[PDB]
Amino acid sequence: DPDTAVTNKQSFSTDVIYQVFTDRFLDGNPSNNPTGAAYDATCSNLKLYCGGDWQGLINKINDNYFSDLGVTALWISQPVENIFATINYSGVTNTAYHGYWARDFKKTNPYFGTMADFQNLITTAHAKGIKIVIDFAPNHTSPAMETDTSFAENGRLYDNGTLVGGYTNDTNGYFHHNGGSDFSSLENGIYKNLYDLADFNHNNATIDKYFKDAIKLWLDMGVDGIRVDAVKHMPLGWQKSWMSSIYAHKPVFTFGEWFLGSAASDADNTDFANKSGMSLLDFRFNSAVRNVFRDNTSNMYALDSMINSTATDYNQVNDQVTFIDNHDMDRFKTSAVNNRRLEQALAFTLTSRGVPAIYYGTEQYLTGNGDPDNRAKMPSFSKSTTAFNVISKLAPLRKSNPAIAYGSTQQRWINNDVYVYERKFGKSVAVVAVNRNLSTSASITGLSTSLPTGSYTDVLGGVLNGNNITSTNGSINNFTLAAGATAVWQYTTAETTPTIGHVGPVMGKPGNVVTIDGRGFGSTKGTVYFGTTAVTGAAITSWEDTQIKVTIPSVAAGNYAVKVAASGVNSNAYNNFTILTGDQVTVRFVVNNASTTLGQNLYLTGNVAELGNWSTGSTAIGPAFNQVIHQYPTWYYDVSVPAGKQLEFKFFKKNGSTITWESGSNHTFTTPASGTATVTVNWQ
């Protein structure tokens, strides 16, 4: 199938995702609505259920609202059964309308629909070329008070109807009983409760197994992608192990939410995107876009600086999901914000790198500050706004022009209020010019681009005052960019040599199938390379001009560049593919008596690529934790490691450049065939 097909669950680079709160979009079936105090027919009390459901989403796919808007994927609320109880938080009744307070991850939420309704959502969507992404929240169940079992449902978890356990009298240790996080460190936010939400203990092997089994059920139902909630609040090691079981079973595009409040690099956030096996919501792109277009606190140089720095930090910047707002911040539209600034921020997100997501109602200019006002009922299904028109003209370009979906980004002209940038992939080129100044036009002279000689019409057809241009071997004739204008000019052609645009997933064990997307691979099965290893023949499960599916070779675990050769021409290399040693389990490593100096941290390495193959650098594990589950001078860390394998390891202390290793012989441990384990040793 081509890269562009609805069938491509491994890459959303050619898609535009529409993020919807299922409850707030359309009540397509009033008979499944909640009753009593939990429901509000008028939807003016935004903490209660308004009644929106999966039949409502089926209706709008069927009357072409989404196809006309041009979105090609729906990201919906968590589909699983949530608590039924209502919770009174200081006088105001709160419900689980948002989907985040799960109680059974193997059943549907009956207010959104039955399993049959879910299956009908998947079929209807796929028949229209729309992918389905679901929220999944493995960090917690629901609000719970250990001392008061009458509060809410005491965070009880059910396994398809059978009780597994609640937060009070949790003798099995399914949940953490460490109090609530104060968010003072990474560690503190992982092993304590987020507010009053009962925190899962994923080191408990029943819970590990439960979540591997629960996600398999939803993948077997045809979901195309997963948005993981609260990835900052769960151990990276457990999440990498859970990600490797998804990719070994039915690989789908997965991204997480790790909140950031500015456009600055955050080392922990960069590491998570690079090492976990999943990508992230791009809050750094989002802060720069709001600062420049919404709040006027930065100018166009902050936009370009964020483009360069994120392309540098993230190994696969094209896997990061971009947006101008969402469920965690004020709606982009405010009375102080003009419509053209929102339309411009949409035009910029849709033509920039990453996977763009639009929060439902953006095309209707929905307002709302804070939670829950930013989650208002979908106000109209009008197809007439300029915002609607901008998304329907630009979203198709991610499918028809590979420079938008996969290209690099280069600055071509910039000053405080004007930004002109270019996307390029092979011979395809897209150039976007934006003038955010609402009252004065800009005379543009000396612009050079990669557009071939020719004249170019604005893809937006002048709806944002864009103009047409003329290229003479890339030099653009002088023109005036109007007040508030944005114009998009493009050139696509067929690629003749192989060039790789995306590989998904970028982590797996031998035997897993990965998807290579791009252009110019031809119809004749060639060879794929993982480093030096050539993979040919039957190992390549399908080969066409824009997409290859290939089995990962049995080669040593490590970091590899993937390259394709078609008719003796070698492509560009796609870097940083992780091959794992095999199936993964999560092991908690605990080391006693490791005293340290001020500013000295503890790290772990060992003899498999998952522990860094004896390196003391960025592939080593750590720094280890020492506050919540075990306390200094005991340190601990949860690590994804190959299953059923005898491992050798040592801890080491590192303060700057100087490394001090444990003495003696290596510690050894044989990992379990599945699940989790804990190994405790003493510092030598």
Tell me whether strands 667-670 and 569-570 are parallel, antiparallel or unpaired.
unpaired
Q: Which residues are 432's β-sheet partners?
A: 421, 488
Q: Is 313 in the site for Ca ion (CB under 5 A)?
A: no
Q: Give min distance, CB of 448 to Ca ion, in A.
A: 51
Bridge partners of residue 225, in order along the sequence: 133, 253
The strand ranges marked E within 464-620 are: 469-472, 475-476, 479-481, 486-491, 499-504, 507-508, 513-519, 527-530, 533-535, 540-543, 547-551, 558-566, 569-570, 574-579, 584-592, 601-606
What does the alpha-carbon distance between residue 80 and residue 134 come to, in Å, rounded to a whole number? 10
Q: Is-catalytic flag, 583?
A: no
To Ca ion, the closest distance from the beta carbon of 118 in angstroms equals: 14
Residues in the chain, total: 684
Segment near Ca ion (CB under 5 A); pick from 29-37, 257-265, 279-287, 346-354: 29-37
Dihedral (C-alpha) 575, 581, 582, 586: value to the nearest 10 degrees? -100
x/- binding map, residues 553-592, to Ca ion, per CB under 5 A?
----------------------------------------
Q: Which is nearer to Ca ion, 51 or 70 (CB)?
A: 51
Is 520 annotated in some ligand binding site?
A: no
Binding mask 145-184 for Ca ion (x = CB under 5 A): ----------------------------------------
Cβ closer to Ca ion: 30 or 454? 30
Q: Which of 27, 257, 325, 458 binds Ca ion (CB under 5 A)?
A: 27
Instruction: For residue 415, say whether it is annotated as part of any ligand binding site.
Output: no
Q: What share of the chain is helix, strand, coil (3-state, %, to 5)?
A: 25, 30, 45
DSSP characters for 87-149? Answer: EEETTEEE--TTS-SEEEEEEE-TTT--HHHHHHHHHHHHHTT-EEEEEE-TTEEEE--TT-T
Residue 65 is assigned to a ligand binding site: no
- The smaller minimum CB distance to Ca ion, of residues 141 and 389, is found at 141
- By CB under 5 A, residue 23 contacts Ca ion: no
**Nearest by Cα to 100 from 79, 120, 73:** 79
Q: Give the amino acid at 326.
A: N
Query: What's the closest the beta carbon of residue 22 comes to Ca ion, in angstroms?
Result: 9
Q: State yes or no: 213 annotated in a binding site.
A: no
Task: Check whether 23 is labelled as a binding-site residue.
Answer: no
* Angstrom distance (rounded) from CA 166 to CA 200: 11
**Options 3, 135, 257, 545, the catalytic residue:** 257
C-alpha 460/C-alpha 312 separation (Å) is 30
Least separation in angstroms between CB 43 and Ca ion? 12
Token pair belonging to 639: 């690590």
Least distance to Ca ion, CB of residue 639, Å:
17
Q: How far is CA 296 from the centre of its chain?
A: 27
What x/- string results for residues 195 through 234 when contact with Ca ion is judged by CB under 5 A? ----x---------------------------------x-
- What residue has token string 């119809």? 523
Q: Give the range of 194-202, 220-228, 317-325, 438-446 binding Ca ion by CB under 5 A.
A: 194-202
Chosen residue from 23, 40, 53, 610 binding Ca ion by CB under 5 A? 53
Instruction: Evaluate whether 622 touches 601 at the Cβ level (below 8 Å).
Output: yes
Q: How far is the CB of 371 from Ca ion (least distance, A)?
A: 20
Whichever of 191 and 406 has its CB closer to Ca ion, that residue is 191
Q: Which of 4, 32, 201, 571 binds Ca ion (CB under 5 A)?
A: 32
Residue 15 CB, nearest distance to Ca ion (Å)? Answer: 27
According to the binding rule CB under 5 A, does residue 33 interact with Ca ion? yes
CA 267, CA 284: separation in Å to the nearest integer? 13
Indicate the residue among 27 and 146 with the shorter CB distance to Ca ion. Answer: 27
Q: Binding residue per annotation — 101?
A: yes
Nearest to 405 by CA among 326, 285, 469, 499: 499
- Report the nearest approach of Ca ion to the CB of residue 594 (Å): 24
Q: Any binding-site annotation on 45?
A: no
371 annotated as ligand-binding: yes
Kindly determine how many residues on this chain lie close enough to bind Ca ion according to the rule CB under 5 A: 9
Please give the full DSSP string across 457-502, using - where no structure is assigned: --TTTTTTS---EEEETTEEPPEEEPTT-EEEEEE-----S-EEEE
Separation between Cα atoms, residue 96 and residue 432, nearest integer Å:
42
Q: State the Cα–Cα distance between residues 11 and 15, nearest whole angstrom.
A: 8
592 is in an annotated binding site: no
DSSP assignment string, 344-387: HHHHHHHHSSSEEEEETTGGGT----STTGGG-------S-SHH
Q: Does 51 bind Ca ion (CB under 5 A)?
A: yes
Q: Is 140 part of any known ligand binding site? A: yes
Site for Ca ion in 510-549 (CB under 5 A): none
Would the annotation count 195 as a binding residue?
A: yes
- Active-site residue 81, yes or no? no
Between residues 139 and 581, which has the closer beta carbon with respect to Ca ion? 139
The answer to whether the CB of 89 falls within 8 A of the CB of 157 is no
Query: Of 136-144, 240-248, 295-303, 394-402, which part binds Ca ion (CB under 5 A)?
Result: 136-144
Residue with tokens 């197809």: 383
375 annotated to a ligand binding site? yes
Is 465 a known ligand-binding residue?
no
Nearer to Ca ion by Cβ, of 138 and 466: the residue is 138
For the CB of residue 161, give the shortest distance to Ca ion in the complex, in Å. 23
Span from 138-146, 290-298, 370-378, 588-596 in contact with Ca ion (CB under 5 A): 138-146
Does position 504 interact with Ca ion (CB under 5 A)? The reply is no
Span 439-478, contacts to Ca ion by CB under 5 A: none
Name which of 329 and 629 has its Cβ closer to Ca ion.
629
Residue with smaller CB distance to Ca ion, 165 or 526: 165
Q: Is 176 annotated as a binding residue?
A: no
CB 52 → Ca ion: shortest distance, Å? Answer: 7
ω into 623 cis (within 30 of 0) = yes
Spatial separation of the C-alpha atoms in residues 146 and 585, rounded to whole Å: 30
Nearer to Ca ion, 111 or 419 (CB): 111
Least distance CB 62 / Ca ion (angstroms): 17
List 229, 422, 495, 638, catalytic entry: 229
Q: Which stretch binds Ca ion (CB under 5 A): 44-52, 220-228, 535-543, 572-580?
A: 44-52
Q: Which helix (H) or strand (E) holds 611?
A: none
In whole angstroms, what separates CA 463 from the centre of its chain?
31
First and final C-alpha spacing in the chain: 56
Kindly tell me which of 53 and 495 has the beta carbon lying closer to Ca ion: 53
Before 633, cis peptide (omega within 30)?
yes
436 is in an annotated binding site: no
Distance (Å, whole) CA 249 – CA 226: 14
Asked if 344 contacts 294 with a C-beta cutoff of 8 angstroms, the reply is: no
d(CA 489, CA 351): 11
**Can you say which residues are annotated as belonging to the binding site for Ca(2+)?**
27, 29, 32-33, 51, 53, 139, 190, 199, 233
**Can you say which residues are annotated as belonging to the binding site?**
27, 29, 32-33, 51, 53, 100-101, 139-140, 190, 193-196, 199, 227, 232-233, 327, 371, 375
**Can you say which residues are annotated as belonging to the binding site for substrate?**
100-101, 140, 193-196, 227, 232-233, 327, 371, 375
Catalog residues that contact Ca ion under the rule CB under 5 A: 27, 29, 32-33, 51, 53, 139, 199, 233
The set of catalytic residues is 229, 257
